[PDB]
């Protein structure tokens, strides 16, 4: 039961790291485009 | 969503502390 | 068996998040260097 | 590799849905 | 015991991916600010 | 911390190889 609880909490951590990677991919793409456009 | 980086930090820390206890126990 | 299957799938998720972090580290380093060079 | 961000999204979603079912069952 | 060992090692991987995401969030924010300031 | 991206890579690879063996066994 401790291992099931650990995997459930680890899944929540993975969802948070996916949210953060998608935020950073959109922000670096924005900056790339801004520099290309300049 | 409403998510901010300060909230993201708090939630990472909360889930990490929990997993540590579950794994030790 | 469900927990083994969960850990196998979570490992695949972690490999995907490592691929994405390495893509973003190379792209932000490129942008840093471009700005330094300008 | 051949990996794109649109494929990365599809695969994250696929593995996340699977883990949800495994954990519920 | 193999599954406990897998979850322990996966937790170490997740901590490494959180370190990397926080490094990249600070570096893209630095670049955003630099461009705003220019 | 002292962490560099070259060390980060080495540690990711080390933990990934371990998990592969644990899961196979």
Sign of CA dihedral C7, E15, D14, A15: positive
| Touching, C vs F (3+ Cβ pairs under 8 A) | yes
Burial (Cβ within 10 Å: 0-12, 13-18, ≥19) of residue A12: middle
Q: Which residues contact A38 (CB under 8 A, 6 or more apart)?
A: none
C37 in Cβ contact with A35 (< 8 Å) = no
B23 in Cβ contact with A2 (< 8 Å) = yes
Return d(Cα E32, Cα C28) in angstroms, integer. Answer: 11
Q: What angle do CA D6, D10, D13 make, to 5 degrees?
A: 135
| Touching, E vs C (3+ Cβ pairs under 8 A) | yes
Chain E interface includes C21 (CB < 8 A)? yes
Return d(Cα D10, Cα C15) in angstroms, integer. Answer: 14
Closest by CA to E3, choosing from D12, B21, F25, is F25
Chain E interface includes A13 (CB < 8 A)? yes
Do F23 and C11 lie within an 8 Å CB cutoff? yes
Residues of C in contact with A14 (CB under 8 A): 10, 13-14, 17
- Using CB atoms and an 8 Å cut-off, which of residues 5-24 of chain F contact chain E? 5, 8, 11-12, 15-16, 18-19, 22-23
E25-32 contacts, C-beta under 8 A, 24 or more apart: E25/A20, E25/A23, E25/A24, E25/B5, E27/C28, E27/C32, E28/A24, E28/A27, E28/A28, E28/A31, E28/C28, E31/A31, E31/C28, E31/C31, E31/C32, E31/C35, E32/A27, E32/A31
Q: Please state the separation of Cα F7 from the chain's center in Å.
A: 10
**Domain locations along chain E:** 1-38
Return d(Cα A30, Cα A37) in angstroms, integer. Answer: 10
Q: Resolution (in Å) of the shown entry?
A: 1.5
* Helix, strand, or coil (residue C38): coil
Closest-CA residue of chain F to C4: F23
Q: How would DSSP label each residue in E1-38?
A: -HHHHHHHHHHHHHHHHHHHHHHHHHHHHHHHHHHHH-
Six-digit token pair at A20? 């953060």
Q: What angle do CA A13, A14, A17 make, to 5 degrees?
A: 90
* Helix, strand, or coil (residue D2): coil
Return d(Cα C17, Cα E1) in angstroms, integer. Answer: 26
Six-digit token pair at E7? 């979850």
């Amino acid at each position: 039961n401790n291992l099931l609880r650990a995997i459930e909490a680890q899944q929540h951590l993975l969802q948070l790291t996916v949210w953060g990677i998608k935020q950073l991919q959109a922000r670096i793409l924005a900056v790339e485009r801004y520099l290309k456009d300049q | 969503n409403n998510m901010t980086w300060m909230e993201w930090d708090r939630e990472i820390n909360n889930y990490t502390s929990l997993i540590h206890s579950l794994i030790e126990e």
